[PDB]
Amino acid sequence: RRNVKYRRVQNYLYNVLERPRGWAFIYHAFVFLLVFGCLILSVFSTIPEHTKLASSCLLILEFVMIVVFGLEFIIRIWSAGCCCRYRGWQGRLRFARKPFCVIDTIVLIASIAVVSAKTQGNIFATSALRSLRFLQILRMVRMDRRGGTWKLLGSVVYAHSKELITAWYIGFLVLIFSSFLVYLVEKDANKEFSTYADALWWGTITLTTIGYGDKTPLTWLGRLLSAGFALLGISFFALPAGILGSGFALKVQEQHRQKHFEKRRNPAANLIQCVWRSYAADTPPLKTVIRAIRIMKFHVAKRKFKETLRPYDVKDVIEQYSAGHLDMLCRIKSLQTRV
Amino acid sequence: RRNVKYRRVQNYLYNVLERPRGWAFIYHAFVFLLVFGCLILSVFSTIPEHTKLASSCLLILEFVMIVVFGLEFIIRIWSAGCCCRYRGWQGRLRFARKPFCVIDTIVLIASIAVVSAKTQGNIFATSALRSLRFLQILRMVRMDRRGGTWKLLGSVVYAHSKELITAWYIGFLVLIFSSFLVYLVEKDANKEFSTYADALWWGTITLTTIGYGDKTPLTWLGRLLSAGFALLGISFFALPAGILGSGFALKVQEQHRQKHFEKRRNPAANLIQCVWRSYAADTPPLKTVIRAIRIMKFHVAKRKFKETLRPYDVKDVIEQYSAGHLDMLCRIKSLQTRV
Amino acid sequence: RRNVKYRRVQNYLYNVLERPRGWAFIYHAFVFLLVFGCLILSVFSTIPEHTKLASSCLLILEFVMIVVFGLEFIIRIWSAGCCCRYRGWQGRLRFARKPFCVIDTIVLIASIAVVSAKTQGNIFATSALRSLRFLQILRMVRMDRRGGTWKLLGSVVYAHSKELITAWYIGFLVLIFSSFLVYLVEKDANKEFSTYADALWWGTITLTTIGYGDKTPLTWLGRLLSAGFALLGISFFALPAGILGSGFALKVQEQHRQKHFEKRRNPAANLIQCVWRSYAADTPPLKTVIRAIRIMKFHVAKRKFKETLRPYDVKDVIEQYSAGHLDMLCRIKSLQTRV
Amino acid sequence: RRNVKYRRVQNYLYNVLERPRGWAFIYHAFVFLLVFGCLILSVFSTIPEHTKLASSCLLILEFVMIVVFGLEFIIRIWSAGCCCRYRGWQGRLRFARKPFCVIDTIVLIASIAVVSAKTQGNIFATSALRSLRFLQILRMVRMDRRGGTWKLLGSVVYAHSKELITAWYIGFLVLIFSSFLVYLVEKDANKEFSTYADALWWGTITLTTIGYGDKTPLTWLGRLLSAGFALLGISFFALPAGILGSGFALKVQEQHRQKHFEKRRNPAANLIQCVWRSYAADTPPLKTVIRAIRIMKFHVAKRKFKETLRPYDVKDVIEQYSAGHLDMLCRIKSLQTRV
Amino acid sequence: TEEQIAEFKEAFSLFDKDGDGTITTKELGTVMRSLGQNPTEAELQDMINEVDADGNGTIDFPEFLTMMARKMKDTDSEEEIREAFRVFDKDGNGYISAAELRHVMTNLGEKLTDEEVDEMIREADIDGDGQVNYEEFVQMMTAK
Amino acid sequence: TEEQIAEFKEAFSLFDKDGDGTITTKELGTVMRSLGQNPTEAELQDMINEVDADGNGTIDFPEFLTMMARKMKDTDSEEEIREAFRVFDKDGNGYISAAELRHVMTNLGEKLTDEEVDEMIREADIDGDGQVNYEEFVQMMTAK
Amino acid sequence: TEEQIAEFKEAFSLFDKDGDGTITTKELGTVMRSLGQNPTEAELQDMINEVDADGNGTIDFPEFLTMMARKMKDTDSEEEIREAFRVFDKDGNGYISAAELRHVMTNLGEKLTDEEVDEMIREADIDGDGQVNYEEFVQMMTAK
Amino acid sequence: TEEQIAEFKEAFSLFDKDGDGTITTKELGTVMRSLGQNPTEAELQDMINEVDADGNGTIDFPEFLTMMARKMKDTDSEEEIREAFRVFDKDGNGYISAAELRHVMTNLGEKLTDEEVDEMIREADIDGDGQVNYEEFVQMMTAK
Numbered sequence A, B, C, D: 001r002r003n004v005k006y007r008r009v010q011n012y013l014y015n016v017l018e019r020p021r022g023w024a025f026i027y028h029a030f031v032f033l034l035v036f037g038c039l040i041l042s043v044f045s046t047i048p049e050h051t052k053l054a055s056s057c058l059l060i061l062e063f064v065m066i067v068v069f070g071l072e073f074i075i076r077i078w079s080a081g082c083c084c085r086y087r088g089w090q091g092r093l094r095f096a097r098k099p100f101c102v103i104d105t106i107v108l109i110a111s112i113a114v115v116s117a118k119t120q121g122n123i124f125a126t127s128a129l130r131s132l133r134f135l136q137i138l139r140m141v142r143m144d145r146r147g148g149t150w151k152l153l154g155s156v157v158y159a160h161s162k163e164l165i166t167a168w169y170i171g172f173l174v175l176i177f178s179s180f181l182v183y184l185v186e187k188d189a190n191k192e193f194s195t196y197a198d199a200l201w202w203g204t205i206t207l208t209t210i211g212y213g214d215k216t217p218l219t220w221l222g223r224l225l226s227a228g229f230a231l232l233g234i235s236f237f238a239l240p241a242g243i244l245g246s247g248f249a250l251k252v253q254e255q256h257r258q259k260h261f262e263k264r265r266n267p268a269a270n271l272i273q274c275v276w277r278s279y280a281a282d283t284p285p286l287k288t289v290i291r292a293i294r295i296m297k298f299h300v301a302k303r304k305f306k307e308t309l310r311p312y313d314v315k316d317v318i319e320q321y322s323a324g325h326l327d328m329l330c331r332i333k334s335l336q337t338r339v
Numbered sequence E, F, G, H: 001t002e003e004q005i006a007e008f009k010e011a012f013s014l015f016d017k018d019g020d021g022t023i024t025t026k027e028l029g030t031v032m033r034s035l036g037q038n039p040t041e042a043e044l045q046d047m048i049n050e051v052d053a054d055g056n057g058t059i060d061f062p063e064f065l066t067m068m069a070r071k072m073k074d075t076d077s078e079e080e081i082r083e084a085f086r087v088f089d090k091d092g093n094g095y096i097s098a099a100e101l102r103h104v105m106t107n108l109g110e111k112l113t114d115e116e117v118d119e120m121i122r123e124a125d126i127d128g129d130g131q132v133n134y135e136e137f138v139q140m141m142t143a144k
């Protein structure tokens, strides 16, 4: 009775914290705002004009954040007990052994040290606090389930290494050559193109389309060369962005496809399990009860499996199609044999 | 006779206003120009140099716009009578209850108040008019059929939340880190990088490729770090644009596919309706007349349905293909049984 | 003998001029350079520093261009005689009636007037020449076969009107709102944001990522708002570029597909022609000769048709596949009837 | 014994140098860093502030680079002996005849001349060294296997010549027209738009979104025209980047597909080879041994071939599918004949 | 088929109500309205188009008997109705429940009377968790 | 089938353990737990849903005999099990090795006892480099 | 086939008009022109390529009889002509109207005389709203 | 098959040249080299893997007879060889010319001697413009 509700709420909190889905993310979103509510405030703390108001608001928000993060930490450790593997003091210790839990506790004690230091007001404590304020972005670092974003970026870069390397090589050649030519045609007329490094800075700031304007060509020949080469360079510098965008889309589609296929793995194993259970099925009353349970488990597993076997992609459906086609091929050959 | 033509023109006006298609949009396009013809004029009214000419032209265009919008309003309410559900005074009231109709009337009375105020010329009336001039963009807000654009944007963002979040996270990390490093290597040599907030502004204006030029690195180490980090940051900041463009294309294609499929829903229901009508068909003269009408309705419904069943996509055609394949599978198995 | 070679060279020149393909384009490319060799020179003629050297080089290049274009014109008119429809004086007149031929002749006489005026050196003749120098871009206008580029752009815009309108609407809202908010938070501190029109100019130059730097936010709140809104605005302003790029690719692929399908039209008609010729085939010697010619024409037409029927796309191949599938369906049903 | 290990290590070094794969690239990556470690240093050598420190570090890195490149050269020539075609002095000479090997040796002797000159310190030797420092990028030029990047770029440009030419034409027209109109509306009020060439420079720097800010419109009409035309121009100038990105992705996918298909060529030829070997198979002991070897070679070749015939693409799988379908068609027709 | 031809001619006379031997759009529309159904001219035009083959704007009795004598039951009709049912068959399992089927019958297209929908669900054995195979229905329609 | 019906009724009595004639979620759960298997309420609800067709929340004996008398061996089951095996058949060659099969049987889904996995591998001839066609298995299951 | 071989040899003699036993591109072209048809050398070359198999540039009588004796009616021809008709069959319904068919016959490819197009439309029963199945035509061509 | 088994045992003795009853990688390699063919150790390892099924690193005579008695002619081989030919059949028309076939045979994969390539082209009737259907070849290989 009491234990049922206790473990129910425990599982609900664990899956709203550690395995967010849907509305759970809202809570995370909320704390994310608070995360920014820290970082931005601290950035404003740098400004000498608002350092007073920013410091006061940052102290208030630091107290609020410490309270919220302590509550989250104690909720999380308490909810870790839900699973048997992490139930009891051994389970709490094991969860504290996780890198993200220790990162959370270290940022928590960094925050408490920050608060105590601000209360003290020591000059060295000021440097300590500015150090420990960047310690709050590690919450974002912990938010992602072991570098999903980094893994996606790396996989996309590797998958498109050919196009990316082509773009980088050609754009780098354009940068070098255009910078050199503009330097040559402006090394004397224009003072800001005094050295080749200056021209390289100009070329980097131009081809990226940043265009600060601190260095710009002045001689008409320099303007013509710069325009002509920038026309190619801007495209070759924008190429990697588009290549990575397309790769991101493709990669995520492929990951979704693979996840959909893996969704079949468990139901299929369950189906085979219950199939052999029923087969091995064939006191006699107890044995008949076992037969009934095994056959109805077979039915439910078959229901699940056929549910998951909807064709996600044209390729998957045509592959099932070709399985059926080979089956037909064998049948028609058997028929022609019979005739 | 008279009523037939009356309701014909009523329906034509209703479907050229409330359900534009093809040439109807031209009319809308025209008023859209007038919409800009207001906004732009009012913007020019802000300029003290052209405030006189702009104010005169804006008064003329405001009179013209009020006339046009009143004509549109009275056309729209009169055309609402076309449908039975909104025929009569009850229908006019019901249409006035629609949020877009009340928005149209409130903007209309805002315009008339604007005109009366300009005639009066009171100083408080000037503030009133500047307020009521922004009340004209709500025509554009009403133009879209209940946030089609917002729905599309949100659906695309949600569908690509993985790539978008990856890009945002990595680009934000690049922004933070590059801004901090440039601040460190320029906090003293360069006066504009005096505080970390200044460096953050520089990083935001750089990685977005806006490149105002108010803050630029000066020390050669600062230039090198800024270039190196900007090379990554510009791509990661341009990623969301490309991701959203691809998502927009994909999403609209999917919406078109779903609309094409829904086009089948009504004809198929009609086909089943007339099929059972004909089946239940089997004074005797009157009953035979009913049989004839039901069977010919069946024929026309079948014509429509087979017309709509053209394969829009490779996936749809291969799905119909697999239906036929399963049919063949059953037939060949039946044959092998017969042999 | 002589006429054969004459018409051979005539056709070669006509298809290297009016229907370029492969190496023919090189010639066009060459004249295109000369086209630029004019425009650029004339642009340099505007510069008062190089007006002398630029004017001399432009006169030399104008003489060269007039010679080249006169040669091309007389080649083109002479080659028009190749086709029977345009053979003889009537044919030359008919070709001169074409809009592009008259445009070529009008630009030619503009060039000769330019040369005569430069020889005269009248002050009014100077204005005449500056007018007639822009008359040379119409060669580029004539280069494309009746607005292929414009047709492609318009078709892509129409095909993606949904995404494009979504992007334009949302980006315009972002521009209006961000400009207004920055104006509000900087109407007083910053002098360049004195009026709302100034803020609108700033917003347009920011969200497009041009970032001139003439107007930049100064107040820290203004900087924060500008950065936050620019992050969205730059993406929404870059959306149309990506949408149009994807649409261009898709549109050109579809046009290629349709052209490949149209390639079948003529061979299929030829096949049916020769098929019925052979069928109607069934002095007797002369009739047998006719039978032989018709049947061998049937063979060659069948060869062509089967050559063109290679599957260009997965959709086309699966459609031929479904034709075969329906054929099999009928056959298997017939079989099951026979059993 | 000794020769086996000798040739084993020789082949390992040859395939880690000339045919890098996987971890081999790391070595290349390392030298690439050194390559930059040269170029960047030399660029810093241009700066008069760091010319001393940069020159010292560049001398150290030049000694290190010369040692590394000499080691690589002698490793490469020694490893060339692995293959029989290049085993012995004739083989070493033949490898030295390769353009990339002679390029490597010429850059090596350029480096040694650089070192000797720096030791001498002659003023003419300084110009010699600045010339020979750019001689190091040719290592990157040699890195790619005969212009893979250039071939990919050219193939993509050609494949999308239609869209690219459309974008270039329309964007060029927008540039010309907008520059001219802004020049007209600002030729007098604004001093920087004094000549049409100045306006063209402004238009190029605007539509590319570089936005230096040296030239910006001042008159409100000029600002309005510039904004309106820049809205189109920025998109049309960004089009080529997106078109090339999509083309790069598509092109590389097609190249991967073709490589996968070519992977079948060798195994299929092997399969046919061993098939006929076995067929021709049918002292008698020796002949039976030959039969056994040929049949087991047939088995292994069949294993390889069936391994490589996995469907890479939906198109490939549906093509094998249609082969099977035609096979079924023939079988079912034969059956209907038998019935 | 003499009795059948006589019945068809009698029905044609009832339709046209005159010796013209042809039924125009208005002639069909008036008789259709007499039953109290409120037609629309557009579907009358579509109907006369779908019956008349000569393209003369009216129906000739030879065509009347031609597209009468044709029986409803056809393989084309078989597959068309099967696919029409499939469009409403979620998951394409060949089974439709007696809840969404009633809603689509009563609401989509020409709305059907609730008593008719009850007739539909009771026509075939609804047993089996409410999922009935539409294939049995298609065969029953084929039987005619 | 009188003996079969008697056995089914006896088993039903053992299940319900009372004259109610129906088995609720708790009634099934208690008897299932008595064997020492630790069920979960959610799968009991899914199970009673998958057996009961009337939607009344409990199983009626008529449905009990209805979904008993149905034999396991069916073509639907044939293809379902074939595809379930295929999901684990790398390269789709129809052959599964006796190494990954054991791992998937013991680990994936409801984990199986190692002795049971040994029984599985020894059920059919493992000879042939360890690759056994799952088709023979599917046929054996079909035989029942 | 002695009479057939004699007729083929007589036709070959009429073609070549000499004892060479071979017909070159010019030899075929002159006889083709004599009928008043204005050929083009390119299609003569393609034609001699499509007949001659030895690749010697001229047609040998053995090849003449070889690709004569082959009758037009073939399954390959059957499917080729079916698909050629399909390319013009909008919606792929197997039916072509007697309006676009006439236009494509008279205009596309080697333009046909209007009298010939009338012959085509009157060859088969145009009745049925003007839509005639091209399959009947393909079978008629198959019959030969 | 007693004579066949005796011949197989004699060949096995010739291979191993000892009473071990097994042939290792080196044992096979030496006898293969004796014919003067210059093997590579890697393909010896692949070969012994493809013959031995016990995974013990050597071939047992029971496996020797097992994968001997299996005849080459199989439907699997039929389709594999058909597709191997198809990979070289441009346009997938079932016909391969006697020019590219010779080049692929002599050059690709284990290069074949020119006399062998001449044997290949002369094995079947090259007539017909040089295009020979590889299907006849596949059937001939099937016959064995």
Ligand SMILES: C#CCN(Cc1ccc(F)cc1)c1cc(C)c(NC(=O)OC)c(C)c1
Pocket (backbone or CB within 6 Å): A167, A168, A169, A170, A171, A172, A175, A236, A237, A238, A240, A241, A244, B231, B232, B233, B234, B235, B236
């Ligand atoms: C094209 C071009 C310029 N290059 C190549 C280059 C290499 C070495 C240099 F010293 C200078 C330039 C380039 C361009 C971009 C946008 C990026 N950023 C990126 O890839 O985002 C993911 C990088 C990492 C390199």
Ligand SMILES: C#CCN(Cc1ccc(F)cc1)c1cc(C)c(NC(=O)OC)c(C)c1
Pocket (backbone or CB within 6 Å): B167, B168, B169, B170, B171, B172, B175, B236, B237, B238, B240, B241, B244, C231, C232, C233, C234, C235, C236
């Ligand atoms: C990549 C990168 C930078 N970020 C992430 C970021 C998050 C918080 C910050 F404080 C700063 C940066 C970023 C970039 C863009 C283009 C957008 N705009 C957009 O998505 O258009 C639809 C946004 C909304 C965020």
Ligand SMILES: C#CCN(Cc1ccc(F)cc1)c1cc(C)c(NC(=O)OC)c(C)c1
Pocket (backbone or CB within 6 Å): C167, C168, C169, C170, C171, C172, C175, C236, C237, C238, C240, C241, C244, D231, D232, D233, D234, D235, D236
């Ligand atoms: C998003 C956004 C801003 N807008 C919409 C907008 C509409 C009216 C205004 F007054 C201001 C802005 C916008 C943006 C671009 C890049 C373009 N150019 C283009 O489409 O290239 C093909 C256009 C034509 C409009």
Ligand SMILES: C#CCN(Cc1ccc(F)cc1)c1cc(C)c(NC(=O)OC)c(C)c1
Pocket (backbone or CB within 6 Å): A231, A232, A233, A234, A235, A236, D167, D168, D169, D170, D171, D172, D175, D236, D237, D238, D240, D241, D244
């Ligand atoms: C659109 C537009 C402007 N044009 C066309 C143009 C032609 C002649 C001119 F004098 C000026 C402009 C343009 C734009 C870009 C980005 C490039 N660069 C590129 O293609 O990257 C691969 C080029 C090469 C031309």
